[PDB]
Amino acid sequence: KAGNWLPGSDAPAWLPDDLPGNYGFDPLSLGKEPASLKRFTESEVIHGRWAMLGVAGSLAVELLGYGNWYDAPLWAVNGGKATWFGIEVPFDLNALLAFEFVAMAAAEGQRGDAGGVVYPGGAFDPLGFAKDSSKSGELKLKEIKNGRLAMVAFLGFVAQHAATGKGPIAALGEHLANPWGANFATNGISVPFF
Amino acid sequence: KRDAALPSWMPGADLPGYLNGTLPGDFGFDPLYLGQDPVKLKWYAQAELMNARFAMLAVAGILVPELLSNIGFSWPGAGVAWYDAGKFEYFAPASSLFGVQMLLFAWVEIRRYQDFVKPGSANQDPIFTNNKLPDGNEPGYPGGIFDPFGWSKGDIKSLKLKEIKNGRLAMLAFAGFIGQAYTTGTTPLKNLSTHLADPWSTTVWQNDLARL
Amino acid sequence: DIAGLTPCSESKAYAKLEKKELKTLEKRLKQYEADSAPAVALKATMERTKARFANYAKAGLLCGNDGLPHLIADPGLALKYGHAGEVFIPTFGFLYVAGYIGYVGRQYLIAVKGEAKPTDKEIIIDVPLATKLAWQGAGWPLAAVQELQRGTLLEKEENITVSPR
Amino acid sequence: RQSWLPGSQIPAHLDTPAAQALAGNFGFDPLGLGKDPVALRWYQQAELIHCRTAMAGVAGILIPGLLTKAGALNVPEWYDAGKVAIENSFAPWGSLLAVQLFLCGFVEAKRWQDIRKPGSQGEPGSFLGFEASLKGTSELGYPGGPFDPLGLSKEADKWADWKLKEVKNGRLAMLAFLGFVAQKYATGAGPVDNLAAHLKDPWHVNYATNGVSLPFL
Ligand code: CHL
Ligand code: CLA
Ligand code: CLA
Ligand SMILES: CC(/C=C/C=C(C)/C=C/[C@@]12O[C@]1(C)C[C@@H](O)CC2(C)C)=C\C=C\C=C(C)\C=C\C=C(C)\C=C\[C@@]12O[C@]1(C)C[C@@H](O)CC2(C)C
Ligand SMILES: CC(/C=C/C=C(C)/C=C/[C@@]12O[C@]1(C)C[C@@H](O)CC2(C)C)=C\C=C\C=C(C)\C=C\C=C(C)\C=C\[C@@]12O[C@]1(C)C[C@@H](O)CC2(C)C
Numbered sequence: 001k002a003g004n005w006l007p008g009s010d011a012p013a014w015l016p017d018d019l020p021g022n023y024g025f026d027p028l029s030l031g032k033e034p035a036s037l038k039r040f041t042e043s044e045v046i047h048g049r050w051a052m053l054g055v056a057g058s059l060a061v062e063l064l065g066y067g068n069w070y071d072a073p074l075w076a077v078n079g080g081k082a083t084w085f086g087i088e089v090p091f092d093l094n095a096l097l098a099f100e101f102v103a104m105a106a107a108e109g110q111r112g113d114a115g116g117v118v119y120p121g122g123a124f125d126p127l128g129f130a131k132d133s134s135k136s137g138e139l140k141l142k143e144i145k146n147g148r149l150a151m152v153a154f155l156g157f158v159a160q161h162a163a164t165g166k167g168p169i170a171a172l173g174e175h176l177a178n179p180w181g182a183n184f185a186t187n188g189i190s191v192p193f194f
Numbered sequence: 195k196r197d198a199a200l201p202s203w204m205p206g207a208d209l210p211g212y213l214n215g216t217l218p219g220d221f222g223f224d225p226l227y228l229g230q231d232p233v234k235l236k237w238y239a240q241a242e243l244m245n246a247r248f249a250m251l252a253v254a255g256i257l258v259p260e261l262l263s264n265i266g267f268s269w270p271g272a273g274v275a276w277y278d279a280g281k282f283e284y285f286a287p288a289s290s291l292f293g294v295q296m297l298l299f300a301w302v303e304i305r306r307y308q309d310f311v312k313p314g315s316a317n318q319d320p321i322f323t324n325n326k327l328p329d330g331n332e333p334g335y336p337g338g339i340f341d342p343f344g345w346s347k348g349d350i351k352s353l354k355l356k357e358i359k360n361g362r363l364a365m366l367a368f369a370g371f372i373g374q375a376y377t378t379g380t381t382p383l384k385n386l387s388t389h390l391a392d393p394w395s396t397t398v399w400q401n402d403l404a405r406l
Numbered sequence: 407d408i409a410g411l412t413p414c415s416e417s418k419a420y421a422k423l424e425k426k427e428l429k430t431l432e433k434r435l436k437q438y439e440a441d442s443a444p445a446v447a448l449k450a451t452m453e454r455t456k457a458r459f460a461n462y463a464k465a466g467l468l469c470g471n472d473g474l475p476h477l478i479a480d481p482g483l484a485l486k487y488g489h490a491g492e493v494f495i496p497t498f499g500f501l502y503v504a505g506y507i508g509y510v511g512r513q514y515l516i517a518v519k520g521e522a523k524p525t526d527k528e529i530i531i532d533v534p535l536a537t538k539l540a541w542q543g544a545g546w547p548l549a550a551v552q553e554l555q556r557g558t559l560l561e562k563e564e565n566i567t568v569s570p571r
Numbered sequence: 572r573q574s575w576l577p578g579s580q581i582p583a584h585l586d587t588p589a590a591q592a593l594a595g596n597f598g599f600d601p602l603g604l605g606k607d608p609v610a611l612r613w614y615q616q617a618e619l620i621h622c623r624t625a626m627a628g629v630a631g632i633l634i635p636g637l638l639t640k641a642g643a644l645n646v647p648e649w650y651d652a653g654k655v656a657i658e659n660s661f662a663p664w665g666s667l668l669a670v671q672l673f674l675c676g677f678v679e680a681k682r683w684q685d686i687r688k689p690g691s692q693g694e695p696g697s698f699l700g701f702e703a704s705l706k707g708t709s710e711l712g713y714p715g716g717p718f719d720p721l722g723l724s725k726e727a728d729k730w731a732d733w734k735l736k737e738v739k740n741g742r743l744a745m746l747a748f749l750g751f752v753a754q755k756y757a758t759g760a761g762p763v764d765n766l767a768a769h770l771k772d773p774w775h776v777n778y779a780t781n782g783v784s785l786p787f788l
Pocket of ligand 2: 363366367369370371373374377378385386388389396397398399401402
């Protein structure tokens, strides 16, 4: 067991001890049925991995000064040419959707027929970090915790943007400038009154 | 069924059995039988402490600041009515302070609730595991670091009775501030001065009849 | 408007009709005294006549070339143009009362079939029972539907007598 | 044995142990709508949905109404809010309602099939692994599970008390809404404004003098 989400509380019985990232957090008992838990265990990792790439991509765009994650796809609706690191890309919206759909369908289709493999290894582990059984146990915990943090972080980007209408890095600088003047309470939406 | 040896709010009156003197300040006062159900009375016992303890702080925080101002002690917040402190301008906006307030209170209150749900389960420091509260503490009375001076090691029963008596009086006082402030329109200590100036002609009967 | 009709409030023939009826009443009035009993009665009639023609125009009815109100029965045309009060709403008003009367009578008839002598309970009404069933009939549509779904509304084909065939 | 009318004869169908297990049973059924046990089971669900919907709706008319008067909000009258909202809206009311019927219809349909076959929505594979938590509890109309995040229904001692509070506030809320509708036509003002008028002069501002309710007088 990784830890305890609510100190002084009991751990659910249906959650195995050796399941990575197990803090005994299941207030709604959504994973009580073994069949449901198996699907959700895979989905959490898949969501985490996508979020980690998503958060990194969102921060990289703004740190390098090419815009923010929100307004990257505006050129399609506004009318313009795509860019990546500042170099023009010839494709257009129709071309991107077709290629993305085909590529994702083929790659995701292969995973779908696997049956729920979360840690394939081999071709996906060229450096063989998780080859050793003992070492893999702790790496899986590290992966999910960073993944869970990334999932929350991305939710922060979307929620914060809706309230403040600014990118993540822009908001962070604003908070540092005036910590007591710029925050969720002072954006005029998060707290109904004041 | 309540024994006649215990203090009674109304001497010579029959009183509920479930008020058997276990709780502090148990004078058998429950004309509406609110606390009849033991489960509910278990909750009401903690609610009285929480409402009482905040009331004692609130009343102290409404009289002392005004008392100092009259004595002449000067500080930037001097001369501000207890119901005008919200409008006063501080280093940070009221909204930002409110947001911090709830985040801080959310941690401590849930910590307090966890003990109430399962006593003794929230007596350990999450970070520095060496720290810990005494294992004998009961809900509503943490002790340990919350009792640095060890007063709880003396006549605890008397101290509990003294706390609830001062607390109950404090709760009534705060209701007086709202009623008096809403009616008189002035600060509490101003009302006391008016009453002392002419106690006989300054009763609430005099004051309210004049208004209507 | 609908079917070539026009609102009675805008109908020339409708307005002329009111004058004809009032003129007839006025002609009879002038053969009496100012405040005699016949005169008061005639004046009361004229007030109701004026009120009636104002109410029908205010109700937004449709008048034909005859200058008389015509009613719209199609539910679609009624709800489309706000004529629901002519036929559509009164349709469900009548059925509630008609089902009320029929349902109450059926309940009473079933109640006395259990008695020793049902025939004597029909010529001589059991008033205490009838009043009890009269009040409970207000919820007949709910009770009627629940009987239908539970299958106790209809008799079995094998328990009903029929002629040779 | 509490009853809506002391000294009256409680209907027999409401005195059965199954009937007395229902929250808020005060023997009130003069029209005999619950005589059939199968019907009473259906009408109990109707009351719960009416109760809960009415409470949410009334809270959405009353709490905004008081805060609007207190100056903390600016919300139009409940009978005008529909027109005000649709103006500064991303969709017309036709499109907004059509979506509402799909989402409500889908959710309502699942609830409907649980009344016909209790616990039938936990059919393995029917949902994307989420069917396990859609089985409901042993009491119809009290789903629990994901609908009870704080787990207040897991305390057996407080269970009967909680259900009684819901039905009592639910019945009161249902009457409140009927009062909002009747008071809008009768007085032509808001609910909170009607309360303010009554409190000013209770003995002259009431339904007995509104000129509508008692036409004969
Ligand atoms: C024990 C709890 C508690 C109580 C009983 C009060 C009671 C009061 N507060 Mg206070 N507050 C409390 C907690 C808190 N307050 C505030 C922040 C404020 C502010 C910022 C203000 C008050 C004011 C008021 C008064 C409201 C009546 C009035 O004059 O309205 C009429 C209101 C006005 C004339 C103010 C108009 C301008 C204002 C900027 C508009 C926005 C006001 C907010 C909606 C207030 C929200 C308060 C809520 C959170 C308790 C009243 C004396 C008001 C006051 O002092 O008025 C003289 C006021 O402006 N309170 C915070 C955040 C740290 C609290 C946190 O717990
Ligand atoms: C803690 C209790 C307490 C105390 C000591 C006072 C003191 C005072 N109040 Mg206040 N008051 C209180 C509670 C209290 N009040 C409460 C709970 C309310 C809300 C209903 C009010 C509402 C109120 C109004 C509307 C007015 C006063 C006024 C007064 C003044 C006395 C004249 C009068 O009409 O009194 C009326 C007050 C009462 C009958 C109090 C009844 C309730 C308390 C709890 C009774 C306690 C009795 C008990 C034996 C303890 C006595 C005090 C103790 C220290 C020995 C005086 C400054 C008047 C004023 O300001 O004149 C200039 C005035 O107009 N009070
Ligand atoms: C007794 C049989 C009967 C007849 C002959 C009619 C005749 C008519 N109805 Mg009515 N209607 C009836 C019964 C009938 N209705 C009933 C029982 C109901 C349900 C309570 C309705 C509900 C209804 C609505 C909601 C509408 C009509 C309309 C119409 C008109 C054109 C469409 C139509 O119904 O075509 C012939 C009728 C039938 C084949 C029988 C079934 C008719 C259904 C129920 C309604 C069809 C509406 C249609 C799809 C609307 C399309 C737009 C239209 C402008 C072309 C026509 C005058 C429409 C209208 O107002 O047109 C001006 C209209 O909008 N009716
Ligand atoms: C927050 C989140 C999920 C949170 C779930 C929670 C709290 C669940 C909690 C509980 O269930 C438990 C555990 C147990 C139960 O008993 C109780 C509850 C309470 C029910 C997922 C986020 C998941 C987030 C994900 C997958 C994000 C993916 C983001 C991507 C791919 C972004 C890509 C791009 O941003 C780039 C890089 C550049 C841009 O220009 C373009 C785009 C396309 C926008
Ligand atoms: C659901 C309900 C109300 C729902 C209200 C909602 C959603 C309101 C929503 C909105 O307002 C907001 C929030 C904001 C606004 O801007 C917009 C709208 C959209 C307007 C009321 C039910 C209200 C239901 C009522 C009043 C029902 C009363 C039933 C009675 C009295 C029955 C009595 C008996 O049947 C018994 C029990 C037994 C028999 O034996 C005898 C008799 C006598 C027959």
